[PDB]
Structure formats: structure tokens, C-alpha cells
């Protein structure tokens, strides 16, 4: 066959889930320009934003009509359960682990070191025989 390698880009389209401020989720509801979109979400304010200020996530909210108001976006977001889909990805998991690490205390860091010593002992023991 032809065997053409295609790009795996993320598209600016109605229904794209985006991160805003590296904390909160929102979805694209309508495209303004090459540079600007209108975003909305359950926990964010409906606003016109520049695509440079947001990051497209690999998640699409399916069947979201163009220009949907806040109620429609919230209802379809709850139905598609976008929050759970986001929280199950390695991206959100790495963000959560970064936050959890940033909340450790000095005593907890000491415990982390001690447990790491124990796990390294076990790992070297397993590695030498395999």
C-alpha cells in the first residue's frame, strides 16, 4: 500500500480540553482566529483567550456544538466525564505527584530516603540474580 506517515497533532476544534494556568481544565467552544479561541468549563470563567496562554490536551469533548453556552458545556462535560478522563492520564498523574512531593516536610523527606534505602537493597538483591 501507500504507507504515508501522518502527523499526530492536536487540533484547535470545538470540544478540545485545554489546561489553563497549568491548573484548571476548560474546553474550546468556538474559534475566534488563528490565535484566539473562546473557552469554557465547569470550574473556569467563560472567556476569550489566546491559544498561546493554554495547552491543548489529548482529550476531545465529543459532540459539542459551536458556540455552546455555559449550561450546555457543563451538562455535556458532566455526561462525557472529562474530569475522570483527565485524571486518568499520565500527564495529570505527573502533575499530582509533583504537587504531592511539593507538600512533603523534612521528616517526610527523611522517611522517603529511608524507604528508598530499603527498596534499593531489595532491588539490588533482585538484580544480581536476574
Amino acid at each position: 500500500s501507500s504507507t504515508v506517515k501522518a502527523a499526530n497533532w492536536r487540533f484547535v476544534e470545538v470540544g478540545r480540553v485545554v489546561l489553563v494556568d497549568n491548573k484548571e481544565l476548560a474546553t474550546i467552544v468556538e474559534i475566534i482566529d488563528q490565535k484566539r479561541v473562546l473557552i469554557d468549563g465547569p470550574k473556569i470563567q467563560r472567556q476569550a483567550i489566546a491559544l498561546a496562554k493554554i495547552v491543548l490536551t489529548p482529550i476531545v469533548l465529543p459532540n459539542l456544538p459551536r458556540g455552546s453556552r455555559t449550561a450546555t458545556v457543563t451538562k455535556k462535560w458532566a455526561a462525557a466525564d472529562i474530569d475522570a478522563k483527565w485524571a486518568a492520564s499520565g500527564w495529570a498523574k505527573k502533575l499530582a505527584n509533583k504537587e504531592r512531593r511539593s507538600q512533603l516536610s523534612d521528616f517526610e523527606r527523611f522517611q522517603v530516603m529511608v524507604l528508598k534505602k530499603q527498596r534499593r537493597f531489595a532491588t539490588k538483591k533482585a538484580l544480581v540474580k536476574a
Binding site: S2, T3, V4, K5, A6, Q34
Partner: protein, 190 residues
């Protein structure tokens, strides 16, 4: 103006398998294989089916859009080169001095040797590019046939032969001698 999207559709004949990976096109047909690097252009490819390939430019300005149909045409020339071939015919034009053209082989290399051009004692030699076949036509007097799979190589050999036979220090409107491309077609007639 930054056109949002511009598209072109390749058409792949039945026996041809285009193959694109990282802007390196490899076209395979009954007549052989041809390859082309397009890394100097920002284009993306989508396989619609086995008979069509979409060529896209996203958010391209006037010149970058202009570089899109040329990509299409280059790949199309590759496609028709491995399924029909290319054939350029050259006619020998002289008023008095016959042009003596031979296909010689020196140092293991093929050359086109032009002698007696305008009576000159100089011997002109043109290297024959790889994948290009030269032939002295039997059906026509004073005709050279340049054929091959690659249109670029064939046309460039024809241009080399035409350019090496330029007339100097004369009225070229009067001294019309030279070797000129008379027919640009394909090996397989259609």
C-alpha cells in the same frame, strides 16, 4: 493573509505505490523506483486511500502556499516517471557544418561527444547522468533521444547538450546552429 489551510490531492495509478516518511517520497512503479527529499518545505501528508494522498499546508502565507502545488507536481512527475518514463528528442540544426554526435565511453563513463559544431576543431563532451539513456535516432536523421525515469535528470541532460552548443561572437538570429529539444513526451505513448 495566512490562509488557514490549503490542500492538494495526489492521484496514484494502479501499479504505483507512493511511500512518504518524514518528507522523503519514494515512488515505486513498473519502471523502477524514484526518491525525492522535500525537507526544505513545511508540508504534511495524509493518505486518503490507496489512490489518493492529501498534501496540506497549515496557516501558510502566499509563498509558502505557492510551494504546495510544486510539491504536488514534483511527486506527480515522479509517479509518471516510474509508470511511463520520460523522453526528450533533440534535433541537430546546422546550416553548413554537419554536427557529428557520438555516444562514447571513456574511463567507464558514458559521454555525448559533439564534433564539428560550426566547423570548430574543439570536441565537446557532455557527461551522461545516471539513470539517463542517450540514443541516436534511427527513424529520424540528426536526432538524439534522451530518455529515463527522472524528468529532472532527463531534462537537465537535454539542457546540458543544448547549452554546450551555443554560438559565440555571431548574430545568433542568423547563426541558428545548435542542438535543440524538439519534443518533450513520455517513453510509453499515450
Amino acid at each position: 493573509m495566512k490562509y488557514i489551510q490549503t490542500d492538494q490531492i495526489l492521484d496514484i495509478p494502479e501499479g504505483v505505490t507512493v511511500d512518504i516518511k518524514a518528507r522523503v517520497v519514494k515512488v515505486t512503479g513498473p519502471r523502477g523506483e524514484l526518491t525525492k527529499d522535500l525537507k526544505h518545505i513545511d508540508v504534511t501528508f495524509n493518505k486518503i486511500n490507496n489512490r489518493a494522498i492529501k498534501i496540506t499546508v497549515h496557516n501558510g502565507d502566499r509563498k509558502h502556499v505557492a510551494a504546495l502545488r510544486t510539491v504536488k507536481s514534483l511527486i506527480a512527475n515522479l509517479i509518471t516517471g516510474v509508470t511511463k518514463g520520460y523522453k526528450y528528442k533533440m534535433r541537430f540544426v546546422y546550416a553548413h557544418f554537419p554536427i557529428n554526435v557520438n555516444i562514447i565511453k571513456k574511463d567507464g563513463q558514458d559521454y555525448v561527444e559533439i564534433r564539428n559544431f560550426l566547423g570548430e576543431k574543439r570536441v565537446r563532451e557532455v557527461k551522461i547522468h545516471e539513470g539517463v539513456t542517450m540514443e541516436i535516432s534511427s527513424t529520424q536523421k540528426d536526432e538524439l533521444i534522451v530518455s529515463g525515469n527522472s524528468l529532472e535528470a532527463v531534462s537537465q541532460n537535454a539542457a546540458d547538450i543544448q547549452q554546450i552548443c551555443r554560438v559565440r561572437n555571431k548574430d545568433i538570429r542568423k547563426f541558428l546552429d545548435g542542438i535543440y529539444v524538439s519534443e518533450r513526451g513520455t517513453i510509453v505513448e499515450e
